[PDB]
Amino acid sequence: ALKADFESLRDQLQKAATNAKFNGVSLADGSTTKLSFLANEDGSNFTVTAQTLS
Amino acid sequence: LNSINTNPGALLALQNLNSTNTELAATQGRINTGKKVANAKDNGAIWSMAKMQS
DSSP states (O other): OHHHHHHHHHHHHHHHHHTOOBTTBOSSSOSSSEEEEEOSTTOOEEEEEOOOOO | OOOSSOOHHHHHHHHHHHHHHHHHHHHHHHHHHOOSSOSTTTOHHHHHHHHHHO
16 A cells, blocks of 8 residues: 555656646756746846756 | 928927827736737737747
């Protein structure tokens, strides 16, 4: 029973990690190493390193 | 110069008043809706991303 509960827990963890998208992109699922955002009128980026939670 | 048939300054004043009236209508719509991006005409990209995420 403890084993089955541990398995349901790992499955819910993977579901919560997969369902963390916003605008089709996410920093948690590990699909991409990073996302950059504008930080200058010349086009310089504001990098945000992804932190995988899967 | 001091012609009676036409005065350029009145035309330029009409253009300036039309420009401020246009921006005033824009801020009036932004106030009555409460969104800076209320519809597709305001900004198509952010509007489509907002509709899909909503």
